[PDB]
Design a protein around this nucleic acid. Sequence first.
DNA 1: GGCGACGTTGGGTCAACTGAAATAC
DNA 2: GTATTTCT
RNA 3: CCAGGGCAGUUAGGUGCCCUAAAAGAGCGAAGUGGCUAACGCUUCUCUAACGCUACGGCGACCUUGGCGAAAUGCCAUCAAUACCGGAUUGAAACAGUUGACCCAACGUCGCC
Lengths: 392, 412
Amino acid sequence: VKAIKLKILDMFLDPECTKQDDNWRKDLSTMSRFCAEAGNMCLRDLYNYFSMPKEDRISSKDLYNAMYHKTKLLHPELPGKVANQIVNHAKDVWKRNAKLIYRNQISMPTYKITTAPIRLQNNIYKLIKNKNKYIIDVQLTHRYFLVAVRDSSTRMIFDRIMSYTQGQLQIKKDHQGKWYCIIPYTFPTHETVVMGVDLGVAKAVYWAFNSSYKRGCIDGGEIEHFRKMIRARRVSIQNQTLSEKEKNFRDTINHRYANRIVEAAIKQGCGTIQIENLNWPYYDLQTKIVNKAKEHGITVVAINPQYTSQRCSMCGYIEKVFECKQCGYGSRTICINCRHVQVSGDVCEECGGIVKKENVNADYNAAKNISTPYIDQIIMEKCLELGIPYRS
Amino acid sequence: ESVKAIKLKILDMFLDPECTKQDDNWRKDLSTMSRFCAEAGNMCLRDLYNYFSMPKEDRISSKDLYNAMYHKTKLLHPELPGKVANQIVNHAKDVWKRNAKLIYRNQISMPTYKITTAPIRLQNNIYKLIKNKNKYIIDVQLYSKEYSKDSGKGTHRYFLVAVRDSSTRMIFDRIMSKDKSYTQGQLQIKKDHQGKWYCIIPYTFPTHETVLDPDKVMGVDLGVAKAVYWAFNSSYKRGCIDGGEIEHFRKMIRARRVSIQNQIKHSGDARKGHGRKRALKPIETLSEKEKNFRDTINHRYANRIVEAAIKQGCGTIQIENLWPYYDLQTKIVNKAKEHGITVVAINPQYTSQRCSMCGYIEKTNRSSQAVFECKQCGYGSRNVNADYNAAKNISTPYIDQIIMEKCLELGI
DNA sequence: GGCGACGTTGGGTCAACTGAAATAC
DNA sequence: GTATTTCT
RNA sequence: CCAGGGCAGUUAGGUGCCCUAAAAGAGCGAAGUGGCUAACGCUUCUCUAACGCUACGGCGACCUUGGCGAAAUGCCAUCAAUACCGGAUUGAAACAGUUGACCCAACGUCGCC
Ligand SMILES: [Zn+2]
Ligand SMILES: [Zn+2]
Ligand SMILES: [Zn+2]
């Protein structure tokens, strides 16, 4: 369900990342091929068992023991934990695909090298952190493999799992031979009760969170297509109901957007709505978002839509894709893991993570500025200093 | 000998030779038949996998395996006639023999026929192309005799295909009678993403006996932005064609698909609560717009490449070894095969760097891509395009050997 | 926006096939 | 002749 | 900036007519993810809109042209469009198609910065 892919660098016999295990890629490839072959063999055994009549068949526990014995005999190099995980995963995939098998919607499920991971239980994998290096401590004595995190979110998740409950660790491969270390995790469930929303012309709404980098844009292809359809049909009628249909669509499209905004607010734990204030019935949308957010107890606050798109989110600079000249927010390239600006390059010097060019849209910047708590005070303390007048 | 296909859309299905009586639910009948064919192919592939995965000592003869697979295909779906059954088994065996080595190496997930829009395969013996008045009818045998006895409807289903093109009419009437006559092939009933059904007739036809000199060879250069440029080795004449909206159509189709897909997050209560197909129903129209625009553009480019060789008598076409470049190359090698023009594949390594006139190798020519000027001989100094230079370079026969010989002496 | 899991669809490559004799009804 | 099981 | 579709054999662009709040509404069911239930980018899913004539069976339904081409530079005539002013500009087609496999990309839900 919830898992993170971690790029691998090398394999070390010791946990200090000093002595590298030579030819570890070939050993891991042979291990994955053995895992795939054993999984295919035990899936064929499952198909043979379930294809036979139920009365003339062995018990389920006997079948699992026989599959485990066959997996151990066919590839003795596979350790017991990995073989048991292969057997369990084959049993699960057969449980999920037996109806497709016997309705012949799919052929025999098999594990290619890409989709056949070295499945390992959580009781044998330990996530340790050592300075910038991240080390997995699986027991295949116990091998320690370098893990290169490439995002700030993946670092926080990895640290939380090290100190979230780990799932069934998977080690897949790719076309180029790159091994991916995918660590599933589980979390306690706990529902929660500040954000903002910008508004353009055809971009519809955009929202950002005050404390989280979560983004979401309502790509108003629906609204644009509806407007084009109404205009074209009106032109055709003139050349040769529409107004009422357009009015009712505008009356119901705010309910869809208000529902989406309320769902996004409830998700990720947000309990306050600081939305903007007023070709389209924006007052209807404001009323709908005020009424629909009150069902969950989220207060809606209306703020002036002045100097919100022009303001920079990072530094607060005001000037007449958005890129303020003070810090170069739009044009800068930053590492995800460290958020330190670099001139160029897709690899960070401080972290070695992914460096992504900032795709800061104007709508998202306006939404994040609107999401700032106490926008009136922070805009009176800035616009008045720069001499730019605003209506209050 | 060459082979092409005649894809004819099905207007309606009938149970009479005169098409007086039609099946009121013929579309769902075709969908059921295609699903049954896909299921039979899946079970045949599963049987092949369980057979070849077992040790050879614990195996029945492969002939007995084929017989057992055919019998299980005929008994699991009694509606499938014998010809459809053996065609399905043959196609499953072909897929297995093409993927067997990688299956043994466990580098391939076991092949699975997609139930949606699955093809229905029929041997050439049963289905007969007939022409009753202006109606074009295919006497497809899609029902077994047991199903005919059980239901009361005849084994033969008359598919009223749409043959409204002059060339399509000519090929239909050429394959209708054997008397240069066309030979029928494995009929295929396959559905498009929209929901239309096609009866595809792959016909084997004799290679055209056009007198083309094999000495004259024409090279084909595939650039990055410049689509294709061709030149002749024996004649200074040449030609070229580039892509107008070559990637713009793909970009706009993908942008529209992304915009429509993102709308489900704020769509109505129906798309969000009636399955994935109900959610991708608006996307279904965009299922093959750019995929089929790939074929339309590549057909046009390959047609001009083969026509240029035919007009100038060039009996050979050179193609560099790799936008779908390989799809264009395949269309070229299949359209030229119709006209009897052999295609030779060569390595395009250092082809652009080598001068088309003197054959010398250079490294500074990589920077200048708008035009080609050879510093040593001065062929372009005394204007020659870089694409034209590469085309003329690859026009001459045995270019890989020349590149290997020249690179060893100098230029690596 | 991205880092991913699951899933699907939607673009590519790439390679082969695109029956016939015999046989029961 | 027609459809089916088989063989390549 | 005059959108998406349906028919016109396929595709792409038009085109002749029609439909559109299909970027839309609903129903059976449990093959799966979720908590025996049905929330789900839940389903072998299905229904939901579309050319003219018909004597209700069926019929018909258009264009992407021909050459010169030491070359995406264009020219000659011919067609269609222009929200440009009878001219100018723009575009001017071919059809080999199914399969499976692999790759990449995109998107839906979910977890998180
Ligand atoms: Zn700034
Ligand atoms: Zn960094
Ligand atoms: Zn030269």
